[PDB]
DNA sequence: TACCCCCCCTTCGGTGCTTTGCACCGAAGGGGGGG
């Protein structure tokens with residue numbers, strides 16, 4: 001009751017509410033009028049604007065919400081259960097009518113005005129408001145700060161109304177202490193059920209079953225339909241993403257591959273055998289429940305990483321072997337061209353960010369890569385990157401680069417001169433090349449851009465070459481793509497080029513400026529342009 | 531009194547989120563902020579405050595205690611009208627020829643002057659929690675912040691008052707102030723330079739500026755681009771060098787390449803050696819002579835902004851270029867560590883921006899060759915400076931990287 | 936006929952050189968956990 005009130009004002013430049021009155025039928029009026037008059041009589045409540053009446057057998061506002069001082073959110077993040085320390089005793093106390101106890105400010109008491117089709121002004125903080133959670137949480141933590149200051153050994157979490165209190169004192173001692181917590185909350189005019197109405201483990205918080213010694217995801221149900229629509233597939237993939245946090249080995253890429261190219265949410269699309277195998281394996285792994293473990297401050301975090309294929313990675317953060325704390329998957333496709341080392345880098349940095357926000361400290365990785373491969377990748381790459389601290393685990397498949405470009409030219413190998421000139425308008429291109437030994441070739445192409453012909457001229461040269469070859473290109477695009485050393489791409493042409501480059505035992509590339517008459521590159525212009 | 535501070539006409543405030551921190555850099559922040567609040571520096575703020583700015587904990591050079599560092603780039607962009615227009619100071623051009631400049635920290639000096647009441651609702655921050663276990667402890671500054679561009683502007687009057695005696699006693703040195711940093715430039719020997727530095731330290735301590743490391747602007751050498759030398763040139767080497775004198779034609783009008791192409795008329799294998807003709811040799815010599823001469827047609831313009839590119843050259847080597855307009859460079863450097871990978875980029879960034887402050891006075895907007903997530907995750911662990919530039923990440927540079935071999 | 940929050944996925948726009956095509960990142964939609 002004697003709680004300090006946070007002042008609140010409306011948005012500068014406008015006024016408060018302007019919604020008109022909302023008369024309705026007389027059937028639903030009294031059923032709300034009596035209870036409203038009762039809560040007015042209790043004393044918690046006691047100007048052209050007014051609020052329309054909402055009857056449920058509840059006050060709603062949108063103009064006010066849009067014309068209110070903006071606030072700063074108090075709980076933006078949700079505590080993942082993996083980071084909670086192993087508390088021996090846990091108790092839940094659900095405060096009731098919490099928003100009734102929190103008062104309102106003198107200025108805003110005038111603005112809050114509800115009139116039934118009798119008018120009252122809120123002398124307490126209303127519900128369903130934009131500012132309600134921040135104000136209520138601030139008041140609640142102000143109330144609870146003296147108790148935590150006086151008692152350090154207990155741990156208390158406040159989520160909206162519910163409060164979860166953990167302790168290492170004995171069961172009788174824990175009940176004793178929770179009694180003074182109840183009394184302290186009652187002193188500040190906040191209700192709390194006695195020991196008869198208190199909840200028992202497992203506690204179902206935000207989709208998590210919580211125990212004194214283990215955590216688990218709430219029972220996840222998968223749809224079982226002979227045919228699947230768009231919304232059913234989306235619900236599926238969402239539930240699989242949600243459930244991946246504790247069940248190892250779940251892949252959802254194939255299922256997601258169906259959602260493309262369509263926009264209608266009521267359409268029906270037949271599956272594919274790859275998606276059928278995905279579903280079968282997902283159901284097989286989801287058949288039996290698994291449980292996490294609670295963190296211990298004195299143990300060393302370890303986060304292994306494993307590969308699935310086509311750009312899926314799984315990880316299992318744990319401290320004691322065969323006792324997990326968290327699992328997850330990474331499948332984002334960043335960039336139109338990438339290889340496995342870059343994706344391993346992205347997965348490692350994502351894991352570090354999650355472990356920092358959840359546990360506060362970076363774990364010791366165990367990557368499926370060799371030291372020499374990493375070293376040779378980082379030193380020879382244009383960008384800068386650092387993997388914190390990792391050891392080597394020999395669990396195939398491993399990560400390695402397929403084709404290594406050579407720094408120096410090759411003796412005894414042919415030297416191709418490739419280019420390509422495609423008209424922007426007629427969509428007709430020509431990919432040709434010549435060789436130092438006299439071999440010449442030219443190929444017409446239909447419906448290609450001015451870069452496609454130049455890109456697959458290298459493909460022509462590689463296809464018509466031997467194991468050792470030197471190639472001269474006059475476009476920076478293809479040179480950059482090939483030097484990036486990709487393993488996959490959006491377009492299949494780059495995949496063909498990669499397949500050719502893997503076969504060659506030694507390949508060398510070289511850029512040459514164009515449209516100047518430089519060397520033999522001027523010769524292929526006569527073959528490809530006219 | 532308190533100098534009134536206002537933003538631009540109808541200019542909004544700092545709305546930036548605080549990304550997570552290590553548990554050590556949160557224990558340290560909690561301890562430092564409790565110490566600061568227990569004697570009046572900071573005051574907790576209620577939920578009605580709608581503005582937030584990031585916060586970090588670093589470790590200063592050759593120190594053990596932790597030091598708070600509050601990012602203020604957004605607030606500085608808001609406030610730029612209050613500092614650039616109101617108190618646009620002149621930059622001492624004599625600081626770029628000093629024998630050796632010493633850097634001292636005067637941020638503590640700002641820990642006494644109060645701050646405007648109306649503006650005080652913008653310097654609000656929050657220390658985060660581990661696992662979102664609890665809502666974060668929030669705070670705002672009462673005294674002037676260290677990191678805001680207007681705080682030097684407010685303290686400038688007292689700074690000049692304190693520095694008039696020392697400047698009058700000895701006019702040889704040059705005094706500059708940027709954020710919490712004071713640069714002192716002397717043409718004196720290092721042995722007596724140390725004595726002068728300790729004398730200035732005592733002078734600052736006497737008048738109430740408690741303060742508990744040397745650059746050599748005369749030894750800062752620009753790096754001209756130089757072609758390689760070899761007795762025998764193959765086709766590949768000629769092709770490499772020719773295009774480099776074609777890209778460099780845009781940078782220098784005096785580079786001509788028409789005779790170096792006379793050696794490349796027909797399809798020839800890369801490995802085969804090619805002799806050098808007299809006209810081509812003359813063209814190569816002239817191009818080398820032009821490359822020796824410095825860049826032409828460039829001049830510093832304080833109205834515009836500086837841009838700094840950094841490229842990784844391998845084996846702990848980095849290059850950097852500071853300019854204002856494309857293909858019109860104002861500087862060129864080469865950092866080297868004769869460690870980590872992000873650590874070297876962080877140190878290079880600090881060196882480049884310190885040099886930019888010493889010569890020009892405004893830090894450049896960096897174009898970093900790093901992953902954005904990797905930078906934002908790792909940049910704090912190796913940052914010992916008490917100020918932060920603005921950086922944008924560059925996806926791809928011209929592939930030749932002609933700046934070094 | 937509400938919001939707000941964290942996560943994961945596909946889709947569109949705008950801007951930059953990697954040029955009139957391609958690439959990139961942030962914004963939107965849709966699911967999941969809710970209060």
Ligand SMILES: Cc1ccnc2c1NC(=O)c1cccnc1N2C1CC1
Nearest residue numbers: 084090155157164165166203205210
């Ligand atoms: C929902 C929730 C959020 C944060 N922490 C907890 C809980 N609830 C628990 O039941 C719990 C279970 C195990 C360990 N800590 C727990 N607690 C902590 C307070 C002791």
